UniProtKB/Swiss-Prot annotation:
ATP binds at residues 57-64. The lineage of its organism: Eukaryota, Metazoa, Chordata, Craniata, Vertebrata. It is linked to Myeloproliferative/lymphoproliferative neoplasms, familial: A familial cancer predisposition syndrome with incomplete penetrance, characterized by increased susceptibility to myeloid neoplasms and rarely to lymphoid malignancies. MPLPF inheritance is autosomal dominant. The gene is DDX41. Keywords: Acetylation, ATP-binding, Cytoplasm, Disease variant, Helicase, Hydrolase, Isopeptide bond, Metal-binding, mRNA processing, mRNA splicing, Nucleotide-binding, Nucleus, Phosphoprotein, RNA-binding, Spliceosome, Ubl conjugation, Zinc, Zinc-finger. The keyword Ubl conjugation applies. Its main location: nucleus. A motif (Q motif) lies at residues 13-41. This is Probable ATP-dependent RNA helicase DDX41. The chain holds residues 169 to 402 of 622 of the full protein.
Length: 234
């Protein structure tokens, strides 16, 4: 693994020392996840410190936990401090290239959120904003307020234009497969989405590749990120 940037938070070698709630630790074990992977060991402390992050990583590296477990922890703290109102949120947004990936990530979020609620946390609310859903479905969930939203870029753009969603309290934005999303034509939509932020945000970008178009994108999207590169082998 290769890490670049100033002020790199030290790596943490176990999930327990990363301070996840017990319900999360129990759920990792139920999923057979016992020890962290290299991008988790270095990436989770980076995200928990509040820094922006570039993860050069692909499926199999354990990237998904890097960008899903911190945002659940942040939302849980926020919901305790001040319960979310109807029409409030999202606080955290994950954008990905495909319906099947968004569904998968959303289900991961709801899994951990269910585990937390079975252990006397509040129930956090997670929205899926993709194609093949009606105005009806989407409007419904956003009516109750949303902690976390998982979206594909064209659908999110539609919702933002129609003022059905607002990014006014969104403080966390993760881009999963940013290379794939730009190759598929969504650069403009993603860049436009960033301009819907009225205030500051922590931005995470995950990509298996890093060609010049993506290097330039990341320069525009992120601020002083820590880069973590798992390597072509790992």
């Amino acid at each position: 693994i290769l890490v670049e940037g100033d002020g790199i938070p030290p790596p943490i070698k176990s999930f327990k020392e990363m301070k996840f709630p017990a319900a999360i630790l129990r759920g990792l074990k139920k999923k057979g996840i016992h020890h962290p992977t290299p991008i988790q060991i270095q990436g989770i402390p980076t995200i928990l410190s509040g820094r922006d992050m570039i993860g050069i990583a692909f499926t199999g590296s354990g990237k998904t936990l890097v960008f899903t477990l911190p945002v659940i922890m942040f939302c849980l703290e926020q919901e305790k401090r001040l319960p979310f109102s109807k029409r409030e949120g999202p606080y955290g947004l994950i954008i990905c290239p495909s319906r099947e990936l968004a569904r998968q990530t959303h289900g991961i979020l709801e899994y951990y959120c269910r585990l937390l609620q079975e252990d006397s946390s509040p129930l956090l609310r997670c929205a899926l904003c993709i194609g093949g859903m009606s105005v009806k479905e989407q409007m419904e969930t956003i009516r109750h307020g949303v902690h976390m939203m998982v979206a594909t870029p064209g659908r999110l753009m539609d919702l933002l234009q129609k003022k059905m969603v607002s990014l006014d309290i969104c403080r966390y934005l993760a881009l999963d497969e940013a290379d794939r999303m730009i190759d598929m034509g969504f650069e403009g939509d993603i860049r436009t989405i960033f301009s819907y932020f009225k205030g500051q945000r922590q931005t995470l970008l995950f990509s298996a590749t890093m060609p010049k178009k993506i290097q330039n994108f990341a320069k525009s999207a992120l601020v002083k990120p820590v880069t973590i590169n798992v390597g072509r082998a790992g």
